[PDB]
Design a protein around this ligand. Structure first.
Ligand code: CU
Ligand code: CU
Ligand code: CU
Ligand code: CU
Ligand code: CU
Ligand code: CU
Ligand code: CU
Ligand code: CU
Ligand code: CU
Ligand code: CU
Ligand code: CU
Ligand code: CU
Ligand code: CU
Ligand code: CU
Ligand code: CU
Ligand code: CU
Ligand code: CU
Ligand code: CU
Ligand code: NA
Ligand code: NA
Ligand code: NA
Lengths: 298, 298, 298
């Protein structure tokens, strides 16, 4: 797109504030940002806020979201679809034109780990170019195993294809499949989908902890066979709904856009890979690391 | 197949009648019929009854089916495998030769949303050419959320490949992935797997309704990540068995041949896309639409 | 690998012995063995014990495994990762060099049907070359449907690609997808992943029996849509954990590395195919047969 040549819009922080006991404002951008998706490989991504996947959103079950998208792309319209919400797609997930803003309001009444993404046609193009992310909706009544959890992180799986190549997006194997982590608390890492950051700077934990991961496979195209090496998932909640309870899973199958809350115990010091067990995708980048120490520090 | 050149056998209605409190007759054809699978693209499908997927079958849990296949194909044998039934495959799902009929009897003792398909070797060829469909077996005791359901439809996902090309069937990406809808009640649409009909003539509902979809991904080859935009599934029953109960799912993973009953609420007027969230497949046709109005009429 | 040319190390029996009420010794080899994966097609597999998938391991929930790997490969290091155990990957799933042995100890505290595989980088290469298998951990309290089961077998699904071709492993479709069966009791078959053995010598059962299959799809890359023709799964336990209970499933979706215990009834004499319902994979070998007779004998 000639109007994207030489464009690299610096990342813009997510803005969020609570405006009532059950109402939250969220303001995001759609913007064009260069991201290093593998060593030496820049992708001029279509993004929310200059991150791909986009910034983490966390709200409470029952919150209505008053969402504003400010479209900084000079030429392509963009939009937002949160899987968390009940909305009219043709009124509430509609396009915002270049250099304009749009505000849409809708409730998040279901707990879980939901994908969000741009919903502008062709949606495959918008998602594959980087416009995907996760919104977590915290359950009003928690999860039954909350009291056992020592530490938590968010991981997202996505693919990258040949740059803005619709043929490849439709018909080609991914070039890269990757994990990123999005921060829940101060100090947690906040990374983009790339082949290397979570290898070189693993997530950290301490021997003996029960870890919770909030996970989503945003695709665009692949399913995920999510596995943590060296452990078994004690508890799994499909899509993050507390009802959807499995136990003792080695591997959790995620559809494209599928989420889960998974919990596992790390019993011994060392480094624990985190994969999709579709090992062609792991080989193409989808391995993160969890470093487990006697103190929880590096 | 030289004997199929210029053949286009007009669709034949399904014939079904109940012959006892727990016994039902079903008569289908195997026939060769031209179907427009994308605009300008005719596929000379191998079909049951001139539909691909084939006609909907609905029976009650505990019904024995006395099934007759009348093979109208001039040269290729065909057969029937219902996933609903307990049967001996090598005695009861056997070939019926051209211009002959066969009758086979077997019980449907399990509630759910089951694939049916031709079982003639090579089965990949028969299924990929169009010989697939759904049989619903209604549970004796219903589903626990029956009283909440306002409106229901059936949707089926399938793929289309290069015409009768076994190499492509085994080794190639689908050319199209599509939804069709099969009628449960008078007035409901009854369509073939194509890229466009359910976009141009959406399924209809009324604001505020709880909709139930009976869904099956008949493949032949792909899994499905089934999602309705703008909503969350309140309840999901895997394979349509009431026991297999999930709640609050954004997306339901279906294996090839996998079924489900899914229920969701449409809260606002507008048009709601229905996708597989494997967006390469959505881009290649697998998007249906649900139009939600203040009255339920267009 | 020049050092593998002309090497075909004869299969070595698994050695296992119980050394305490909750402690078991297991000794395996890593070795290079020719396996006929389709008629006329030899693959010089990287294996445990000269089998691919490797030999069945069965232990009890709560057993600590004292595992020794004796690496007979003349040039490539190998390792072992059991999904059943809690272990430090970087201390306990580490490489054993050519002509050396390593012993690692770790507990299996979770019941189920777990993948094991070599964990040496690149793991895709080790798994795709044949270094995969199943360990079953028997639940202390059994499964609720134990008393109904008449006969049981183990089946494993894997793929084969172009020989030791990392490009194909990452980016290509499988050349073959196959089932094998591993013996639980004297007399049961014990086979390698190939396109034909379980067609030509089906598993055997008797009319009216409830059969249990312990299944795992070891990949490396594909998901499985596991289905037995002519029946419905009465009960399914995902990953073999008794908690994860489904009923009345036509088809069970397995992620890569995913396991299950599935149970079904065979009501009539005949031959019952067992497939992945991703029919491109079935066509490329992934069909086993179950022959059901009035006596249970051939
Ligand atoms: Cu309140
Ligand atoms: Cu507001
Ligand atoms: Cu966009
Ligand atoms: Cu979506
Ligand atoms: Cu792929
Ligand atoms: Cu703890
Ligand atoms: Cu009766
Ligand atoms: Cu009759
Ligand atoms: Cu046929
Ligand atoms: Cu089938
Ligand atoms: Cu595909
Ligand atoms: Cu209602
Ligand atoms: Cu004891
Ligand atoms: Cu010992
Ligand atoms: Cu190895
Ligand atoms: Cu593994
Ligand atoms: Cu494949
Ligand atoms: Cu019995
Ligand atoms: Na308010
Ligand atoms: Na009768
Ligand atoms: Na001991």
């Amino acid at each position: 797109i000639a109007a994207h040549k030489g464009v690299n819009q610096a990342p813009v922080p997510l803005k969020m504030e609570r405006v009532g006991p059950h109402d939250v404002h969220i303001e995001m951008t759609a913007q064009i940002t260069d991201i290093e998706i593998d060593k030496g490989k820049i992708y001029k991504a279509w993004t929310f806020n200059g991150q791909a996947p986009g910034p983490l959103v966390v709200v409470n079950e029952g919150d209505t979201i008053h969402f504003t998208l400010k479209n900084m792309d000079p030429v392509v319209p963009h939009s937002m679809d949160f899987h968390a919400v009940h909305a009219s797609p043709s009124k509430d997930f509609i396009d915002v034109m270049p250099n304009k803003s749009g505000t849409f309001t809708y409730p998040a009444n279901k707990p879980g780990v939901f994908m969000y993404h741009c919903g502008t046609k062709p949606v495959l193009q918008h998602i594959a170019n980087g416009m995907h992310g996760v919104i977590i909706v915290k359950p009003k009544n928690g999860y039954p195993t909350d009291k056992e959890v020592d530490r938590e992180y968010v991981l997202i799986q996505n693919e990258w294809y040949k740059y803005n190549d619709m043929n490849d997006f439709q018909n080609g194997v991914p070039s890269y499949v990757v994990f990123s982590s999005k921060a829940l608390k101060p100090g947690d890492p906040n990374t983009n989908g790339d082949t290397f950051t979570l290898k070189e700077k693993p997530l950290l934990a301490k021997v003996g902890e029960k870890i919770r991961l909030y996970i989503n496979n945003v695709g665009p195209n692949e399913v995920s066979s999510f596995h943590v090496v060296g452990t078994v998932f004690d508890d799994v909640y499909l899509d993050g709904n507390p009802n959807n309870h499995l136990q003792g899973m080695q591997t959790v199958m995620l559809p494209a856009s599928g989420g889960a809350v998974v919990e596992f115990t790390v019993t011994r010091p060392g480094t624990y890979p985190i994969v999709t067990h579709q090992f062609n995708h792991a080989q193409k980048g989808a391995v993160a690391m969890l470093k487990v120490t006697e103190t929880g520090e590096d």
